[model samples]
Target: MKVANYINGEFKEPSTGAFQVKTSPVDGSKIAEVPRSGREDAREAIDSAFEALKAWANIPAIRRAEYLYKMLEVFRQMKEDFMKILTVEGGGTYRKVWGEVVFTERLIQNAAELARHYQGRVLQSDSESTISVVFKRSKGVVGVITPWNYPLSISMKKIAHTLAVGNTVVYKPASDTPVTGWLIAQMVAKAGLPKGVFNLVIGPGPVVGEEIVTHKRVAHVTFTGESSTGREIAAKAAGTLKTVTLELGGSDPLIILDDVDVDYAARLAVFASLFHQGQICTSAKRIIVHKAVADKFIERYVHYVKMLRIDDPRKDEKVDLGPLINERQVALMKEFVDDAVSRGGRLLIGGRSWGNFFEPAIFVDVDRNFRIMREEVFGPVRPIVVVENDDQAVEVANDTDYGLSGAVLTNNVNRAFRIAEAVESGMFHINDVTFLEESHVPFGGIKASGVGREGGEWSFHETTYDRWVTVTLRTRRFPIPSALK
Candidate 1:
């Protein structure tokens, strides 16, 4: 299949007439011939989006939300197709792909409601003749850049709310998963949105991404990827003084307390750490367990990891996991495990890789400062750290530079609240996985994890700005005017 860029509400071929072959990480099967768009393609997309911004922004927020409602309607009918596309193009298991689609649905629904809630504030004026008001107005031509992991949901997380707040978008999906980008563009077209309201350009980061971020016409940018790349984007967008929202990397810690059921905690840890092959930014990379329950947690966690079926998601309906996004990720998993073992970390179970398939690796007696423990390993590598007490647990979790998400498994409400307060992460959960996310909550991170927030009303703030307007019924002249006269 020849996948084309979606610009001006049409499937247009790239100006360069160059294309790249997209392959499945599952078995290296060719998925499609995706567009190798360049700076010109991105410029064209931004121009189209810019052209549509005035008309789009003029529409009332509530009326703009109706388009989102239609999108949700069309999206539901095409759910299975999205799942299949993600399974092949992104190497996600069926259940994981299903979750992505559901999250996308929630994002659309929440954004639709948020449009009605995107109201400005009214304040009392000092003068009786003057009326003071603040209007929440859209930013023109938003640039949405998404990564391969959770491509569908992450794309919608920005696109849905961006449109909800009456802004047009120029989107560039990760080159690894361009087919899903194409699929979403098709869905938006079926929903009958106006031309140039949403544009997609699939290509390399240097060419396509640079243009979107640095383009003077692009008012705001929302990016999800590596922290290093996020920093570069912030710097580039600085040149144009464009507002930005970055959802970057995370080395999220999941704290397992002694007060919880060991069996359930073990199961949750496996799911949290290894879901989507642990390619998630919020995946529980560090399992910080209280020393009292550490042994039991390790045993159960290893057993669960052993039982997880890693296979091609396309063939197995009951597969628990699929391959990593590509061979490069598989190699990274190997490197992380080797370094951890070299640092005297004992591998409790599963340290093997072939092709893009990597066994979920769990390490015990891991040094807190080891790369596996501190760094954001975007693969199925779990490092176990035993903390002596609750305070130590909070200390260990807070030690990371990336503070995207964290979780505490405990029955003690006070303990959960205390840890939640102490941990420096954007999203926190009690008795749940670090992977939890919803459309209604403020999602994103702090420190190196990211800057700014996404989801619900938080997205409204990022997509729109306050414009204060006042109507003066009576005019007051200054004495300086008489001197000029």
Candidate 2:
């Protein structure tokens, strides 16, 4: 299948006739021939978005909400296609892809509701006979650069809100997973989104992404990927002084308190480490447990890890874990384990691979200075550390430069709140895992993790600009105000 660029309102080939082949990470099978757009194409997309912004912003905010609702229905209609694309083109199992879809659907639906509550504020003005109000208006053209992982969801985190708040978008998906973005654009087409209101440019980041970030027409850029890329984007975007929101990588912490059930916490640990082969940016790379329950937790965690089935998910044995995104990803996981083991870390289970299928590794006594513990290991590797006291657990969890999301698994309500406040992360869970998030909350990070929040009203605020207007009850002169003062 050929996935062409969705420019204006229709699908078209690249002007240069360049193409990029998308292959399934599952088996390296050809998925689609995607258009390889260059700088001119990116500029064209931005121009289209700029043209459409006037009319889209002219539409009533409530009417824009209706378009989002229609898109949600269209999304539901094309659910299976999205699942197949994500699972085949991206590396995920059938069940896992479906779960992500279900949650994503909720996110879309929630964005639909945000239009009703997109409220501006009215405050008492210091001047008499004048009413002052502040309102958020749409940014003309927002450039969306999404990650290969979480393709459908991440792009929409900005795209949906951008549209709902009446802003046009020029989306550039990761080259590795352009098909998922194409699939979403097709749904947008089916939803009858206006010409140029939503545009898709699929190609390399340096070529396409550079245009998006540096374009003067593009008012804002929101991205999700590595910290290195985020920093590069911030620097490039700084040249134009455009607004930016970056959701970068994280080495999140998961703290199991001394008051919790060790075995149950270990059960949660298995899901946290192995879910989606641990490619999630929010995945807790550091598992810090209180010393009181560390031994029991480690033992149970090993038992759960051993019970997990690791292989190609299509084999149909209810496989709990699947392969890494590709051989390159597997090699990274290998490097982390090799470095840790050399530093006297005990690899209890896993640290091996067959093809791209890596064993869900559990390491104990990992040195805090080791690469695996310090960096964001985007794989199914768990490096557990034992903390002496509860306060120490919080301190160690917050020690990293990343402050994305972490968990404090404890039944003590007061203690949980204290730990939550202590951690410098943007968001944290009380008893649940660190990766838990809904579409309503402000989800982003602090420090190197991310800049602004995305979701519902928070996303609307980030993707839009504020327009303040004042109305005088009658004819008023500005010179008279200074004389009265």
Candidate 3:
């Protein structure tokens, strides 16, 4: 494939005489070579976006939504091709890729609706002579940095909403997965987006991503990646006092109440822990099960996990697992498993590792202080711990420093609601796993997980805030002028 950079409505080669190889996770083979953009490329993209912001922002919201609608049509028409490319370079099963498509499409459609519904407010004040009107405006240019896992979905989450509110974007996708980003740029071009409205630059983070964050022309920076990296970006962006939004690491928990349906809960647990090789940020890494049903849940969960078929992502068979993105991920998963076993935790099923492929692992009797329980495994590993009661479950659930998402599984609706309220997370699902998400609802994290929300009508509020405008009907008169007392 002839991979290139899309900037200023043109596909061109990098000024730097450098290229990066895109490798297939399924087999360690070179898939394609993409241009490795540097600081100069980042500058060019930002400059183009700055030049185009005025015209693009001046376009009516209705017209902007029309372009988004056309992009959605293009995405629908190229669904198959999108999925194929996602599976080949992004390293996920066909089913996983399809799910990502659904999420991405829903996000875009929601953004389209939000564009029309975004309205300002009129304040009713005590002063009769002054009229206060508060309305939101564009942030000019936004810098979007997406992660490798779920590249398409994450990028859409940031770009769609940002553009819907009349902001131009300079996006830098992960070096490991640039194909999907390029594909998105193609879709935008076909959708008749104005020139320089959506620009893409593919390259390493320190070189390309740093340039985008630190650039004076860039107005805001939004990123999805590790917490440490996010902190570094935040520090760099702080120099210019630029706006920033970070969706960093998460170690989500799943609390199973005593009244929960063991069969349904266990099935969801297995699915959550192993789906997409457990590469999701919202995957339930720690299971805080009630002591009453812990044993029964484990037995059923292991059985279901064992029955899952593991194979290539393109196959039509009913496979439950796929390979990790690269050898580094495989090694990380293996290290987590080894650490768990060494700490006297029992390995339930599937802790073995292969080259680029790690089996689904479930560990029992895990200590809360263990590294696997406290940190994000980011792999197909499940750590089950027994809690005495509901209070204990809630305590353990909120014990982590990172609170991105959590779930409570129970048959009782009242109890579910109560537990959901007590859980410390930006999003909580009752009677389900943490992987469940709706594009219309607000999504983000608390504490170290992230800084701001990313979904629903509230997203526009963060992406664009309004400035207050006041109009005076009469001119002011000085008291000394009326009576020279």
Candidate 4:
């Protein structure tokens, strides 16, 4: 395929002489060759966005919202096209991909509504004649860096709100899955957005992403990926004093309380850990179950894990699990399982690999200090640890450096709320697994997980802020102390 860069209202070649191939995760084969956006290409994209921001930022909010509405229409019309690309390049079953589509569409629709509701607040002032009002303003050009897990949806979360609030953007999608990003650019273009308002550059992170962050013209940076990379981007943005939104990785946990439904919770646990082959940042990697019901939960959980059929996502109606993205991911998952078993941990189910496919594995009686429990193993592996009670469960859940998300399955609402509040994660689900995230709610992480929120109507608050304006209705003379005396 002849992949090209979307820049200055047109598709063109990279300024750099290099290119890279995008391979399918289902099977190791070339999907397409995309532009390798080096320093020059990045500079070109930034320049185009910078020039476009001059006009895009000046456009009326309602008019800018018109563009978003048209984009929504385009998405609605091309829903199937989007799904196919997501499955081919992004790596997920049709069902999972469709769920992402629904979430992304809702996000855009919400952003359009948010554009109409962006208003200033009026507050009472100390003086009788003076009134204080705070109104929001755009920060100009925004740089968006999205991840591969949910490329289209993650990019939309940043692009939709930023554009709705009158900000032009230059985006760098994950190199592994740039097709969806390019497709988004095409959709925006077709939606009648003003030229230069949105642009996409596909390439490696260091070459394309670093340039976008350090560019003098870029105003804000929004990123979603691993924490280590997020920290580096934060430091670079800090040097320029540019505004930033970072959403990083997580080792999210699921605390099964004693009052929980074991069968339902066990099913949810299996779904959460093995969904997308456990590639999600919020997948329940750690299961801290009460020792009283631990045995029953483990038995059912292992049964479900073994029952899952693994194969190509495109085929197999009964298949609930799929391959990891690549061999490296498979090897990493196997290594963690091996190390854990070697360190006195017991494997209840799969602990082996087949090519890029690692069967859904379950580990029990694991020490909290084990790498499988402590690290963010972004693959199909679940570690169930025994805790004395709810307090110990909470303690184990909060023990990791990550605080991205967590969940507690329980029938008691009060107990669930208490544990949810005590947990260190940014998002906590009461009866559902950690993978369940709605488009209209706040989504992000704390500590090493990430920075800032990504969803909800208030999410735009993180993208833009307001400056207060005060007007004096009538001129009044001020008396000096000497004159008054």
By the lDDT metric, which is better: model 1 or model 2? 1
Badly placed stretches (over 4 Å) of model 1 are 477-485
For TM-score, candidate 1 versus 2, the one ahead is: 1
Model 3 agreement with the true structure over 212-242: per-residue lDDT tens digits:
9999988899899988999999999998878
lDDT of each: 0.91, 0.86, 0.85, 0.84
Cα lDDT, model 2, residue 358:
85
lDDT of 1 at 457: 89
Answer with 1 or 4, whichever has the higher TM-score.
1
* lDDT (10s digit) by residue, model 1, range 405-459: 9999999989999999999999898889998888978998998999998899899
Query: What are the per-residue Cα lDDT tens digits for candidate 2 across 1-485?
Result: 66888989989787889987777776677888898999988988999999999999988888888888999999999898988778777777777778878877887888888976788889788988899998878877999999877888878777888889888999999888899989888989999989999999888899999999999999999999889999999999999899999999788889998888888898898787668888898897899998889899889989988998776666663777777877888899989988888899998999778777788778888867888777888998889999998788887887788979988899998888988999989988888878887888999999889899999899998888777899989776567557674
Q: After superposition on all CA atoms, what RMSD does each candidate show versus the true structure?
A: 1.4, 2.0, 1.7, 1.9
Across 177-226, the per-residue lDDT of candidate 4 in tens digits comes to 88898888888988978878898889889989999999899989999988
- The residue-level lDDT of candidate 3 at 352 comes to 74
| Residue pairs of candidate 2 with colliding backbone atoms | none
Off by over 4 Å in 2: 473-485
lDDT of 4: 0.84
* CA shift of 65, model 3, Å: 0.6
Candidate No. with top TM-score: 1
| Worst ten in a row by lDDT for model 3 | 311-320
